[PDB]
């Protein structure tokens, strides 16, 4: 009936001024636009249909055409920036906001979905959706005693749309919008649906990806313990954004970092640092490097949790980018740690895998590693045990690796090497 129409026929129906003809043609357009293989978004735009679809959003007496056109425009707005812009340019933003209050749940949901795609295009449309007043009516849809009474799909769409209002930078979302959304996000973060939890974590990860003040707005809401709980989830789609959020937080102050340690996050790292997903291991190791960049009592907690052997493990065998993060973790540890903590690192077997990575092609990791060796040596100096460390380094082939580094391109690389050699390996 409305299956496989030509764009020509859709236009003919939409221009008929018979509202039932328009309805059938709009549904035909929805069907074309919801096909998986190359929906003809550009042909529909070029046919001039967006203004008609937008006017149909306002037809309160014909809820079916509101739904069909909301679906058609949602799928156009799901495309390239230029496609989403065509939708915004036709006036869709206030028309979708008005539909948020529709008595028909399927129409309200579809308007939530369309605004999620518009806001998801980037900072400018995100902020334009906010200026048109989307937040108050979106939040009102979630103002129920128990989220479990909402249809599951509807709640997932609302959560996803809210996450796009939290997403993107340059600029980050307006501070007042973030403050307005946060109590609802905290509540969604405690909901029991895996997809709501994942998108709630994504939203929190965006809000903490920024300067310390943005992190504090989130940490002050008390969400860190729940994020640490979700870090432990079996679902990779939840662990991924929960870990990014935790990693973001520990880029903040020493005090923000302590909240993450206090909430028990370090106990999850034996698993994260051996996680079969490369991206999780790499993110977890980056996060460890920011914790070892912390205070001596925070380095002590990394020790107490048994995490130094795990760092030795990642240095010994991991994806190269993960080994690079491990190298930073070690350099930060040795830069901030006490001599006891540093000695401990050597006793855990850090020296050999550190030396092995000196054959890396990457120049930056060479610098980082040489920096750590220098720090370890300075610790050894204070103990009078410089010589023992020299032998350890020579025995595992490390001196050979360093001596050769005197013939490297980079200045800092050659300079740092010769300093090591002349000061410790006469």
């Amino acid at each position: 009936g409305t299956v496989n129409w030509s764009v020509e026929d859709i236009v003919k129906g939409i221009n008929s001024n018979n509202l039932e003809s328009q309805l059938q043609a709009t549904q035909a357009a929805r069907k074309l636009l919801s096909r998986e293989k190359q929906p003809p978004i550009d042909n529909i735009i070029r046919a001039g249909l967006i203004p008609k679809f937008v006017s149909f959003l306002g037809k309160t007496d014909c809820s079916p055409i509101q739904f069909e056109s909301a679906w058609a425009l949602t799928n156009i707005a799901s495309g390239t920036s230029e496609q989403t812009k065509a939708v915004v340019d036709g006036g869709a933003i206030p028309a979708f906001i008005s539909l948020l209050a529709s008595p028909h749940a399927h129409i309200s949901e579809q308007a939530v979905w369309a605004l999620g795609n518009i806001a998801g295009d980037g900072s400018a449309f995100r902020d334009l959706v906010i200026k048109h007043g989307a937040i108050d009516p979106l939040l009102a849809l979630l103002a129920v005693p128990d989220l479990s009474t909402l249809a599951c799909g509807y709640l997932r769409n609302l959560t996803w749309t809210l996450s796009n209002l939290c997403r993107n930078k340059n600029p980050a979302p307006p501070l007042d919008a973030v403050e307005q959304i946060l109590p609802t996000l905290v509540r969604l973060l405690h909901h029991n649906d895996p997809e709501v939890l994942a998108d709630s974590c994504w939203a929190i990860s965006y809000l903490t990806d920024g300067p310390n003040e943005r992190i504090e707005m989130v940490v002050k809401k008390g969400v860190v313990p729940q994020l640490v709980k979700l870090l432990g989830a079996t679902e990779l789609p939840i662990v991924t954004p929960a870990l990014r959020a935790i990693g973001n937080i520990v880029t903040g102050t020493d005090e923000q970092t302590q909240k993450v340690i206090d909430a028990g996050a370090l106990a999850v790292f034996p698993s994260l640092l051996t996680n079969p997903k490369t991206n999780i291991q790499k993110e977890a190791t980056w996060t460890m490097s920011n914790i070892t960049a912390g205070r001596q009592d925070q380095i002590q907690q990394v020790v107490n949790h048994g995490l130094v052997p795990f760092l030795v493990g990642v240095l010994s065998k991991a994806d190269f980018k993960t080994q690079k993060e491990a190298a930073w973790a070690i350099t930060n540890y040795t830069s901030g740690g006490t001599v006891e903590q540093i000695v401990y690192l050597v006793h855990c077997g850090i020296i050999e895998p550190l030396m092995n990575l000196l054959s890396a092609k990457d120049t930056k990791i060479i610098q980082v590693i040489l920096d750590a060796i220098s720090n370890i040596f300075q610790a050894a100096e204070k103990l009078g045990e410089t010589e023992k460390l020299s032998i350890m380094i020579e025995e595992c082939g490390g001196l050979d690796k360093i001596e050769a580094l005197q013939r490297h391109e980079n200045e800092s690389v050659y300079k740092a090497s010769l300093n090591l050699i002349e000061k410790y390996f006469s």
Partner: peptide, 7 residues
């Protein structure tokens, strides 16, 4: 000495 996430 905290570092941003790598590219």
């Amino acid at each position: 000495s905290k570092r941003a996430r790598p590219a």
